[PDB]
Design a protein around this ligand. Sequence first.
Ligand SMILES: Nc1ncnc2c1ncn2[C@@H]1O[C@H](COP(=O)(O)OP(=O)(O)OP(=O)(O)O)[C@@H](O)[C@H]1O
Ligand SMILES: Nc1ncnc2c1ncn2[C@@H]1O[C@H](COP(=O)(O)OP(=O)(O)OP(=O)(O)O)[C@@H](O)[C@H]1O
Ligand SMILES: O=P(O)(O)OC[C@H]1O[C@](O)(CO)[C@@H](O)[C@@H]1O
Ligand SMILES: O=P(O)(O)OC[C@H]1O[C@](O)(CO)[C@@H](O)[C@@H]1O
Lengths: 425, 420
Amino acid sequence: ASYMTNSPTLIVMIGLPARGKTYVSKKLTRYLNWIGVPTKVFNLGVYRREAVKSYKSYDFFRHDNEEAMKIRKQCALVALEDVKAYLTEENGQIAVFDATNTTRERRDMILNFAEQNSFKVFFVESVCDDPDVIAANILEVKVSSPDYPERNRENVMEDFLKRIECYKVTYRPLDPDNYDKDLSFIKVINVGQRFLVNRVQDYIQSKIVYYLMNIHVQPRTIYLCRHGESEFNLLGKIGGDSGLSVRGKQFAQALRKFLEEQEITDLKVWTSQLKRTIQTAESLGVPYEQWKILNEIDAGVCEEMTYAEIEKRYPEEFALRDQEKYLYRYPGGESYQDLVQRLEPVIMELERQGNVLVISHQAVMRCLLAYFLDKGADELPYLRCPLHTIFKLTPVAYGCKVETIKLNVEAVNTHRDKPTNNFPK
Amino acid sequence: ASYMTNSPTLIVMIGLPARGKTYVSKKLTRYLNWIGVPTKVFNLGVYRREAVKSYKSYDFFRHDNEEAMKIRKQCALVALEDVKAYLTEENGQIAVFDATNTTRERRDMILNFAEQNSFKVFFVESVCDDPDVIAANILEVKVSSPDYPERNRENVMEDFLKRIECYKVTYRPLDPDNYDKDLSFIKVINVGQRFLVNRVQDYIQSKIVYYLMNIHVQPRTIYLCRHGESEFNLLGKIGGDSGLSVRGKQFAQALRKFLEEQEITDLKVWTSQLKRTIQTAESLGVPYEQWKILNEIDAGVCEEMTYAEIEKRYPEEFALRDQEKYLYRYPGGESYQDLVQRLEPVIMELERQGNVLVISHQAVMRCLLAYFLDKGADELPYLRCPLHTIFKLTPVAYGCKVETIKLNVEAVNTHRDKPT
Ligand SMILES: Nc1ncnc2c1ncn2[C@@H]1O[C@H](COP(=O)(O)OP(=O)(O)OP(=O)(O)O)[C@@H](O)[C@H]1O
Ligand SMILES: Nc1ncnc2c1ncn2[C@@H]1O[C@H](COP(=O)(O)OP(=O)(O)OP(=O)(O)O)[C@@H](O)[C@H]1O
Ligand SMILES: O=P(O)(O)OC[C@H]1O[C@](O)(CO)[C@@H](O)[C@@H]1O
Ligand SMILES: O=P(O)(O)OC[C@H]1O[C@](O)(CO)[C@@H](O)[C@@H]1O
């Protein structure tokens, strides 16, 4: 009177080692938080390493190893108690349980935990049988996984290959035709070549599946920059549709040279529909695609004004925006929250693809950086993205490599800091 | 070909007769237009009926009926030419091709058309093998399909069953393991019990899959009404959080009696978080759920004012809102477009479920009616939803049955027409 319509959700990863589970867990968790759903990942690798206080050879992972199996089960129970605390005491809505969970006994233990606590359960099983995908994932584990010592990885590969065989002995995949016909799940096959989806129960499960249709697990690189310096940038005017300054044109030429030197396979170039990004791309000698949704934030009645003019003409609005820069909405225009919402299709295409250069704008690029660098709404409107600097991004399971490349053309500074040190607040 | 990320897309239905193809095509097309992607459905049943100028017995659908096969192929080619015009001359972005397309030869013809025109292709194959799902779909065809004469349907079932057998003879399903491993598609199995998705190539294909995870094909009924009359309604005041007038409470009591008479299985009742909808649901004697996203449109600095007061205090804003009521945003508040965007999770849950009563508000309910009755943004802010009237909606493939039930409790009129 009522029942289970308002329950939180436990997303349970399944798979053999080196299947992309931790990458998927982390990026899915970031996406769910991005759309406003409080979500936390629980990485059982961390739990078990902290419990045994040493790195473990493949024999630790034998299903026969009674002593190891008992330690590993206890770690799962501790993590589940942390899941419960998060979802019932800490205002979490979704918990993501990143572990192998390859046996039916372990999955039934999780399901019984969820039923006792009225948590919905959705399984994400990563199945890789393509030799190239497998060999790639395994090599990535060998090089970067923290489940082995930081240095001296010469014997990691041989051990890890044997650890996988231990899991293969007892692995029961989800069986949609019989044993698991009533469970809600998705099998992600070969990191997203195809999918088997069973019994999607509700809106949030549809969003989870939606996100996983856009994820890309193999290493990829994306490039972000602004249009070259514009005339309005030189004037300190926001918004508008002005063209490149002569220095912005020099930047566009330098950008062409930089892209040639980078030797990028199958480069795609995306711009907005505003002249300054188009003009930047036109100098590159390669096809490009304009996106309306990459247009700069709309400043409404403040379009084409300087900050000094805005503070003078609209002192109350100007102070409000400084107090609440993410949520503030220009009269007749947009807030950063509005901008975030309309950027979602570009963000999904950038989750999917590598070798894309996005030529956009200060506020737009802040949103894209906040998404791929996992920054919150508080910091998002203040992220620094100078004119004539390229951001080169390589996402990894626990974050994103960022390289900045300042090209050799000067530009004005358009970054206004939040006012500091004022009294009262 | 697919050389651009935002090139046009041809969605191609596949399946035997009575698989929900035509319902899925139409509801997906409506959803795509709702989120701003111009989409048009092409119903090959209509093309072929118009060309052959008569109803056809199962004999027409034999794969070995050479003369019929040639006509059917020519209809597919005509429809593809209309697809081309829609996507290249009329600024369409997605075309939905509703046909059986059960043979590899027909699918290859479509694929070659798409490649010649640089259209992306995504197939939606409806596979039904559950006897209950099939039997239901077939009876629905028997009752309502326009592929048979309107009256005297006594021989329809026998003919239609033989027509299905004609198609079973040559049906080749999509084969993800070999023949069709490089095609982009979703198999919808038993109208959404489960799905097989292959090679999603872009954002919009992921949105198509997303929508299909929420669709419900079997007939269902949902109920929409407003909160009972509020004190602010009696005062002509917009917005706010006032409670029910005594007539709104009387309506809530009448609503309980109405719901009992409807003999509804597993009724769900959804309200907003505002007092007037909660108090309406509380008279019903059943569990109900509050949704913040069902709260009435936010009028910002005009909250709790009458239209006359708004016109006096903010004449320019009042006139702008009349010129552009869908997009206009109240200072400090919302536009109908904002309202549409935040309603998406409840719209998806209403696509999925039946036996739901939503008790909401004038602007909210306009958005929900615009979605399920396929109304455009121009008309959405002016749809009429009187206090104390229940809208009973039964979606069908070509629209929605609508019954309005005025309960016997008077209420003020809160509907303001656009000035002439
Ligand atoms: N706690 C962590 N901190 C940083 N990176 C991590 C962490 N856990 C996993 N990763 C990264 O996840 C990837 C896979 O290593 P993990 O140690 O998760 O191996 P695995 O579980 O066998 O593989 P997978 O999770 O891909 O199925 C590596 O890139 C690794 O650096
Ligand atoms: N042109 C139309 N106008 C109104 N309703 C239609 C039209 N075409 C199909 N429908 C509806 O679609 C549903 C299925 O009928 P249809 O004629 O499409 O049979 P079918 O193609 O064998 O079945 P399905 O499309 O479900 O595979 C029925 O409710 C029918 O009324
Ligand atoms: O939110 P902020 O810090 O005002 O930055 C966005 C502004 O920056 C610019 O891209 C450059 O000044 C303007 O066009 C835009 O209004
Ligand atoms: O968009 P309209 O026609 O002003 O209707 C919305 C108004 O209707 C009401 O629901 C009832 O007057 C108000 O609370 C709301 O502001």
